[PDB]
Design a protein around this ligand. Structure first.
Ligand SMILES: [Cl-]
Ligand SMILES: [Cl-]
Lengths: 185, 185
């Protein structure tokens, strides 16, 4: 039947094991008959974004100029738009699912450049402050964590998975969120 | 005397660079002594490396740059210029003279730059016929001229100099306009 393509994002704070969670999302999608899909890295993910990264590093190494924060942001959204229009949207159009890692002024920019385009499911990997501290060895972070948790409550396309628990527990939960979500479609 | 930011706008062949010299000389006579020239297309290392980045991608012919991403890369240069060159200059008491500073284009401005506006915009009006002749030495041009002239009539911080007349006449008027505006401050 070749189910409708969809766009699934994997968000989370450092040490959430996002790349390892991406694998679990893919395995579950395989079990559900999803066979054709694309893994994109949202930081990076296109040649354009890679060349912007090398440009910023080429400038910072020399010195004699400092990239203003706002300038970098617009370059970040330029990278995201390039990914949405040249990789993600076409991939969906061919029938390929797309699984991605790490997708007031920020909101205004999004509503302008991306318009209504949003991920179909966003999987937020929550990690507690203790967990973040273990990974750093190998807290402004509580405020960012809080924002993610507000968006998860307000947004029906955001599902949270407690990433602090053992691997097989996270796999159980990701597999459950995906099954429930797929069935609803 | 509070630093000020003056922009010189106009269609190609309006001779904005020569106007920029004449604005400076009037300010020197009025006792303005420390100031900065900027070229709005370009004007930072960032803008320079963004321009070379676009051309390097064009000469390959194997990647297409989405239009929206490119515009974000255009506004990234403008933001860099305003935040690392212009605003610091005004803060040092230097004046700034700049050269050459769809509804969605303006919405980005209101998001990133906010209420920041040039103190004076100096519009050099040439008919698209006259301007193109001088460039050698179109509907898009006729529409853009109308937009500049309407904003000129409606915007008190915009003053217009007819550039279609001989250069010696343009020099008299530019010199008079800046002189008149400075008195009004
Ligand atoms: Cl991680
Ligand atoms: Cl010109």
């Amino acid at each position: 039947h070749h189910m409708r393509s969809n766009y699934i994002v994997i968000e989370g704070l450092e040490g959430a094991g996002k790349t390892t969670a991406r694998e679990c999302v893919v395995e579950t999608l395989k079990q559900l008959g999803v066979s054709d899909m694309v893994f994109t890295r949202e930081p990076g993910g296109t040649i354009l974004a890679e060349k912007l990264r090398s440009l910023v590093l080429d400038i910072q190494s020399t010195g004699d100029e400092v990239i203003n924060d706002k300038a970098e942001v617009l370059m970040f959204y330029a990278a995201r738009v390039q990914l949405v229009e040249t990789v993600i949207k076409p991939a969906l159009a061919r029938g390929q699912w797309v699984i991605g890692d790490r997708h007031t002024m920020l909101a205004t920019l999004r509503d302008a450049v991306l318009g209504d385009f949003r991920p179909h499911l966003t999987l937020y990997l929550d990690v507690t402050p203790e967990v973040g501290l273990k990974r750093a060895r190998a807290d402004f972070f509580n405020r960012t964590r809080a924002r993610y948790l507000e968006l998860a409550a307000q947004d029906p396309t955001i599902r949270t998975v407690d990433a602090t628990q053992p691997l097989e527990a996270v796999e159980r939960d990701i597999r459950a969120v995906v099954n429930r979500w797929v069935a609803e479609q």
